[PDB]
């Protein structure tokens, strides 16, 4: 039952400091190293650091050596990632992951033994500006196909950093739903759209309210959208 | 740097036998392993060493080498095996992941509806116009939309999003926001987003206050 | 360091290869040495083990036929001859010993080891 837990992720601001968790469980913790792989938004897997047990077992990428130090505690169970002097390109989903002890010695042309297990991840948002997101109502058209399909939904504009959440009628409403991701400005902050198609027959009856929730900045709204004029 | 994965993305039907490539970094020999991933969820372990099956990994997947580069082979593509690929390597004392491959499923041809929206009373408010087109539910990804203000072509000042392919009907949708100054979107009466898939241009339009 | 094994490399399945594994100190101490093997995502595996002082060997029920351990007229070499190797073998092959007598169906338990090597790694595929 290998289980890994990473903890401690959160916002940052560039050139502050964060330290990573990563809890292991249901193995002998000496016989393995731990890795930190982190995953950009929306871009590859990146290696970042691993280490085995003791001091003498680490090794980091090009890309943030100097920067960031990892350790352990081999009485608790536990990796520890401290990150220093953070920039916007640090912002990822963090992972742990378990390897070999011995990963570098044994690695060869014929031998690989990768990472089995990973954690679920932690995400960690490097902010320079914080701003709640503006949400304007995307209104169904007067001209729906009367006995068919409508279109109605959310403009969710001018918000930092990441995420925004946005479900419908507090998530009574799944079917259909479209939730776009983000774009960046050239104004420096992001934007997006969630539209839903819904029964035009039920314009009249039926309820509609999109739910955005920008926890960076703890602004929780709730549109109604209604038809226009 | 990392490493180049031979087709960068590449769609396939249920039963098709599928082969990605990792190209290794010049002079660096070392066993590939390969990693499978869905969005949202962390990275699994396919196979180690270049050509080892990791438990309760099913044996359409395999691995092998190809002259000094290195390939994962899925025998017949099954509906959970859509997503992405990365490869791996422990060259000294670094490991470094591929730029990966998305396997997406290959579907009939569909056609976007496509609705248009005007600025909210809400926000002109604020001086700005957003004008969004939504094409909804179409295959494949490629689609052009083109903006049009009382018949000029617009450029330089929208941008597009695309979903991913939706998990029920393996179709995409695309949003493209045309964004004006309040004081440009008011002194124009007709807005038109034009959506070209192969042969066939679909345009929604309306009039400024009708 | 204290054990050192050698030997790993890339077989066919069906194939042979010998491990070593070389020691240190006085071997006149050692009570059991054995080799352990390690695959990704299962736990470390007791594979072959010699009681050294009549040189009683210990099998899994996984290799037992296939596997031959075995010292020489050195005292401070333990072989193990692997035969009729299938892709299941693929793993890390580790050398453990003790100095601590322990009862003989505790010999294939990595928990009555003190030390061990780094390990050679084994790869079986086609
Ligand atoms: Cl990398
Ligand atoms: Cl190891």
């Known amino acids: 039952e290998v289980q890994l837990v990473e903890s401690g992720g959160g916002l940052v601001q560039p050139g502050g400091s964060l330290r990573l968790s990563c809890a292991a469980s249901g193995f002998n913790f000496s016989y393995y190293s731990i890795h930190w792989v982190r995953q950009a938004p929306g871009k590859g897997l990146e290696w970042v650091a691993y280490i085995s047990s003791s001091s003498s077992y680490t090794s980091y990428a090009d890309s943030v050596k100097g920067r960031f130090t990892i350790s352990a505690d081999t009485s608790k169970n536990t990796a520890y990632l401290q990150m220093n002097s953070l920039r916007a390109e640090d912002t990822a989903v963090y992972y742990c992951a378990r390897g070999y002890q011995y990963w570098q010695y044994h690695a060869s042309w014929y031998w690989n033994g990768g990472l089995d297990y990973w954690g679920q991840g932690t995400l960690v948002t490097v902010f320079n500006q914080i701003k709640g997101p503006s949400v304007f109502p995307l209104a169904p058209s007067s001209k729906s196909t009367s006995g068919g399909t409508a279109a109605l939904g959310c403009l969710v504009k001018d918000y930092f950093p990441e995420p925004v959440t946005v479900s419908w009628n507090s998530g009574a409403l799944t079917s259909g739903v479209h939730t776009f991701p983000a774009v960046l400005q050239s104004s420096g902050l992001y934007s997006l759209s969630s539209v839903v198609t819904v029964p035009s027959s039920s314009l009249g009856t039926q309820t509609y309210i999109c739910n955005v929730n920008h926890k960076p900045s703890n602004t929780k709204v709730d549109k109604k959208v209604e038809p226009k004029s | 740097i990392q490493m180049t994965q031979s087709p960068s993305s590449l769609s396939a039907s249920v039963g098709d036998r599928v082969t990605i490539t990792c190209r290794a970094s010049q002079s660096v020999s070392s066993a590939v392993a390969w990693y499978q991933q869905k969005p949202g969820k962390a990275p699994k372990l396919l196979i180690y060493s270049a050509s080892s099956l990791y438990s309760g990994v099913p044996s359409r997947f395999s691995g092998s080498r190809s002259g000094t580069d290195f390939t994962l082979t899925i025998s017949s593509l099954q509906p959970e095996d859509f997503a992405t690929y990365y490869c791996q390597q422990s060259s000294s004392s670094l490991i470094t992941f591929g730029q990966g491959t998305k396997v997406e499923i290959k579907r009939t041809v569909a056609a976007p509806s496509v609705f248009i929206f005007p600025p909210s009373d809400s926000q002109l408010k604020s001086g700005t116009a957003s004008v969004v087109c939504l094409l909804n539910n179409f295959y494949p990804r490629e689609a052009k939309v083109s903006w049009y203000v009382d018949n000029a072509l617009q450029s330089g000042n929208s941008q597009e999003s695309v979903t991913e392919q939706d998990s029920k009907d393996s179709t995409y949708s695309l949003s493209s926001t045309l964004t004006l100054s309040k004081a440009d979107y008011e002194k124009h009466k007709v807005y038109a987003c034009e959506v070209t898939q192969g042969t066939t241009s679909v345009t929604k339009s309306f009039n400024r206050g009708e | 360091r204290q054990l050192v094994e050698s030997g790993g490399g890339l077989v066919q399945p069906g194939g042979s290869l010998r491990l070593s594994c070389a020691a240190s100190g006085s071997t006149d101490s050692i009570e059991y040495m054995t080799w352990f093997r390690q695959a990704p995502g299962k736990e470390r595996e007791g594979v072959a083990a010699?009681?050294?002082?009549?040189?009683?060997?210990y099998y899994a029920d996984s290799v037992k036929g296939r596997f031959i351990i075995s010292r020489d007229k050195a005292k401070n070499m333990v072989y193990l001859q692997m035969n009729s190797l299938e892709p299941e073998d693929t793993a890390v092959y580790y050398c453990?010993?003790?100095?601590?007598?322990?009862?003989?169906?505790?010999?294939?338990?990595?928990?009555?080891?003190?030390?061990w090597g780094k390990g050679t790694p084994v790869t079986v595929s086609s």
């Open positions: 453990g010993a003790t100095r601590k007598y322990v009862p003989v169906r505790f010999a294939l338990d990595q928990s009555s080891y003190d030390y």
């Open positions: 010699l009681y050294t002082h009549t040189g009683n060997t």
